[PDB]
Amino acid sequence: AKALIVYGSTTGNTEYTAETIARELADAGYEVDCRDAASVEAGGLFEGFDLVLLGCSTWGDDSIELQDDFIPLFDSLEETGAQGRKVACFGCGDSSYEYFCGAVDAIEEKLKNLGAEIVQDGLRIDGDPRAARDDIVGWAHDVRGAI
């Protein structure tokens, strides 16, 4: 199994999430390519991947904005090869904002509309990812089954 993890992270929380999930899937024997969304090109981005995991934190006060690096990729997602792709999504935010990890909800909606196959409900981390390290490792373990 070949996985691609793309993450948008401002303060490092989701990047630490994506590292932790990449180590879990590498430990289980998946090939893993993990990339900062700021370095990537939407063009056929997901071709050849058995599993694609997209991580993005949430910004904004009364509106949901996606993490700033991730926006460009999000806007071209139809250009990626997501139809039929087995995909899941994750992100850090904070339960005291009106839309808690609303970026994870906006990337899942867009992915579902594309015919993506979401194997697992989104990982939404409230607070510091280093405290929810346990739920991060189990979510990765669990996405390896939805497959």
Ligand X SMILES: Cc1cc2nc3c(=O)[nH]c(=O)nc-3n(C[C@H](O)[C@H](O)[C@H](O)COP(=O)(O)O)c2cc1C
Contact predicate 4/33, CB 8 Å: yes
Residue whose CB is less far from ligand X, 50 or 68: 68
Nearest Cα residue to 57 out of 131, 107, 3: 107
Q: How far is the CB of 138 from ligand X (least distance, A)?
A: 19
Judged by beta carbon, residue 14 or residue 20, the one nearer ligand X is 14
CB-based contacts of 146: which residues, under 8 Å, 6+ apart? 86, 88, 119, 120
CB-nearest residue to ligand X:
93
Rounded least distance, CB 124 to ligand X, Å: 8
Give the Cα separation of 93 and 141 in Å (integer).
Answer: 22
User: In angstroms, rounded to a whole number, what is the distance separating the alpha carbons of residues 38 and 73?
Assistant: 8
Indicate the SS3 state at residue 118: strand
Cβ proximity to ligand X, 14 vs 120, nearer residue: 14
Write down the least CB distance from residue 31 to ligand X, Å.
Answer: 25
Q: How far apart are CA 37 and CA 30, in angstroms?
A: 21
CB of 59 to ligand X, least distance (A): 5
Residues lying near ligand X in the complex (CB under 6 A) are found at 9-14, 57-60, 67, 92-94, 97, 99-102
C-beta closer to ligand X: residue 99 or 114: 99
